[PDB]
Amino acid sequence: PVDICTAKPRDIPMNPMCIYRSPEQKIPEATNRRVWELSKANSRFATTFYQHLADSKNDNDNIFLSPLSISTAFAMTKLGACNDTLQQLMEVFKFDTISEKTSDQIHFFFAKLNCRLYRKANKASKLVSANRLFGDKSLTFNETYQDISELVYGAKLQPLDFKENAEQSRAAINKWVSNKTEGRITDVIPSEAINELTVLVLVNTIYFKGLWKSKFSPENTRKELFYKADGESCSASMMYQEGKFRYRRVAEGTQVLELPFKGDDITMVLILPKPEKSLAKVEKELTPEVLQEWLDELEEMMLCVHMPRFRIEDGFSLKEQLQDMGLVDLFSPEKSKLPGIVAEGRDDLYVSDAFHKAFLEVNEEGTAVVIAGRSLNPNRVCFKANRPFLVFIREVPLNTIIFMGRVANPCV
């Protein structure tokens, strides 16, 4: 058997059909440098992408996505891309910065990055996903590309009958995503998004619910108002607890909190601006550089946390955003170049759409209820998220942004 999580680049040949060439922080412990430069590229992508997404939604809309899952998905098209289609992919996803070798086997190193993240979150936490590319059956796909796809992406491109059965193919895709995630993620693809001209569709969905390292007791949960950005109140279920947490009050009174999941390797980071400063302002003024700086400066202390329990199920087409960021030729029937995906003959292949959907569930649990005693451990500070705040889910050592979002409305 071939273990991609232990195997090395040479163990199995999987070079792309085309390659590309364009004209400090300490490296984490026990980490491959290429997986690391890859993780840093995704963070640069997440910044630009989140920005476009926010400036396309309503300040009062929640957001939740996995830039990591998106970058991985488009690294699979990159595998068979050439010319301007490939260049655009590289520049938009920030792959045009990393080194040659990392760039050429990017799909492989993404598997490597993912292997590491999958086994860390599932130790105790809940991290399931369902990713796949679907092509119209009338086409003849490159078998070598298939073998590489199944090895490095979990599954190979799935042929469907879009020309004669668009709705049924639509239903099969939603049913398949739902199956792979035990009913957690449904209706990834909205009706109308798939018709008889569909040829290739990208689908990447991800779910999570980590077991809190220190959970909230339900008996301390109660309704309380939550002040949304528009100006309206809102009855939300506010959880509460006291414990030791990494905290920090930064510039302009913005508060940063880190709530770790069991294991400590994966944590949630909350950014809460002062009642005066809008979330939108922090969304624009924040970069990976400043975030890493805040995360570096956090101090551990006893404090109280008031946090609403919430649910965010955000799904959407990636097409418009990405084109707006410069990924154009990939979605164009006339200009697209993805020779590596199809067998030899002559291809007019291009991506019809790309869909993402991520689901985050947060409650008291995240088995015996724990208690801590009556010793004197005063709350130094108190973090009350009764207004819009940002959310990040990351892998500590590598600082990999796994999920990112905004809780603009938790109530009903």
Ligand X SMILES: *[C@@H]1O[C@H](CO)[C@@H](O[C@@H]2O[C@H](CO)[C@@H](O[C@@H]3O[C@H](CO)[C@@H](O)[C@H](O)[C@@H]3O)[C@H](O)[C@H]2NC(C)=O)[C@H](O)[C@H]1NC(C)=O
Ligand Y SMILES: COC[C@H]1O[C@@H](O[C@H]2[C@H](OC)[C@@H](OC)[C@@H](O[C@H]3[C@H](OC)[C@@H](OC)[C@H](O[C@H]4[C@H](OS(=O)(=O)O)[C@@H](OS(=O)(=O)O)[C@@H](O[C@H]5[C@H](OC)[C@@H](OC)[C@H](O[C@H]6[C@H](OC)[C@@H](OS(=O)(=O)O)[C@@H](OC)O[C@@H]6COS(=O)(=O)O)O[C@H]5C(=O)O)O[C@@H]4COS(=O)(=O)O)O[C@@H]3C(=O)O)O[C@@H]2COS(=O)(=O)[O-])[C@H](OC)[C@@H](OC)[C@@H]1O[C@H]1O[C@H](COC)[C@@H](O[C@@H]2O[C@H](COC)[C@@H](O[C@H]3O[C@H](COC)[C@@H](O[C@@H]4O[C@H](COC)[C@@H](O[C@H]5O[C@H](COC)[C@@H](O[C@@H]6O[C@H](COC)[C@@H](O[C@H]7O[C@H](COS(=O)(=O)[O-])[C@@H](O[C@@H]8O[C@H](COS(=O)(=O)[O-])[C@@H](O[C@H]9O[C@H](COS(=O)(=O)O)[C@@H](O[C@H]%10O[C@H](COS(=O)(=O)O)[C@@H](OS(=O)(=O)O)[C@H](OS(=O)(=O)O)[C@H]%10OS(=O)(=O)O)[C@H](OS(=O)(=O)O)[C@H]9OS(=O)(=O)O)[C@H](OS(=O)(=O)[O-])[C@H]8OS(=O)(=O)[O-])[C@H](OC)[C@H]7OC)[C@H](OC)[C@H]6OC)[C@H](OC)[C@H]5OC)[C@H](OC)[C@H]4OC)[C@H](OC)[C@H]3OC)[C@H](OC)[C@H]2OC)[C@H](OC)[C@H]1OC
Ligand Z SMILES: *[C@@H]1O[C@H](CO)[C@@H](O[C@@H]2O[C@H](CO)[C@@H](O[C@@H]3O[C@H](CO[C@H]4O[C@H](CO)[C@@H](O)[C@H](O)[C@@H]4O)[C@@H](O)[C@H](O[C@H]4O[C@H](CO)[C@@H](O)[C@H](O)[C@@H]4O)[C@@H]3O)[C@H](O)[C@H]2NC(C)=O)[C@H](O)[C@H]1NC(C)=O
Ligand U SMILES: *[C@H]1O[C@H](CO)[C@@H](O)[C@H](O)[C@H]1NC(C)=O
Among 276, 344, 373, 376, binds ligand Z (CB under 6 A): 344
Taking the complex as a whole, how short is the minimal distance between the CB of residue 85 and ligand U, in angstroms? Answer: 9
Among 140, 179, 191, 377, binds ligand X (CB under 6 A): 179
* CB closer to ligand X, 85 vs 204: 204
User: By rule CB under 8 A, what string of x and - marks binding of each residue 318-357 to other proteins?
Assistant: ----------------------------------------
Contacts to ligand U from residues 329-358, by CB under 6 A: 337, 339
178 binds ligand X (CB under 6 A): yes
179 binds, among ligand X, ligand Z, ligand Y, none (CB under 5 to 8 A by kind): ligand X
34 binds ligand Y (CB under 6 A): yes
17 binds, among ligand X, ligand Y, ligand Z, none (CB under 5 to 8 A by kind): ligand Z
165 binds ligand X (CB under 6 A): no
Please give the residue whose beta carbon sits closest to ligand U in the complex.
83
340 binds, among ligand Z, ligand U, ligand Y, none (CB under 5 to 8 A by kind): ligand Z
234 binds other proteins (CB under 8 A): no
10 is in an annotated binding site: no
**DSSP collapsed to 3 states, the chain:** CCCCCCCCHHHCCCCCCCCCCCCCCCCCCCCCHHHHHHHHHHHHHHHHHHHHHHCCCCCCCCEEECHHHHHHHHHHHHCCCCHHHHHHHHHHCCCCCCCHHHHHCHHHHHHHHHHHHHHHHCCCCEEEEEEEEEEECCCCECHHHHHHHHHHCCCCCEEECCCCCHHHHHHHHHHHHHHHCCCCCCCCCCCCCCCCCCCEEEEEEEEEECCECCCCCHHHCEEEECCCCCCCCCEEEEEEEEEEEEEEECHHHCEEEEEEECCCCEEEEEEECCCCCCHHHHHHHCCHHHHHHHHHHCEEEEEEEEEECEEEEEEEECHHHHHHCCCCHHHCCCCCCCHHHECCCCCCCCCCEEEEEEEEEECCCCCCCCCCCCCCCCCCEEEECCCCEEEEEEECCCCEEEEEEEECCCCC
32 binds ligand Y (CB under 6 A): yes
215 binds ligand Y (CB under 6 A): no
Among 178, 214, 292, 317, binds other proteins (CB under 8 A): 214
Show binding-site residues.
36, 116, 132
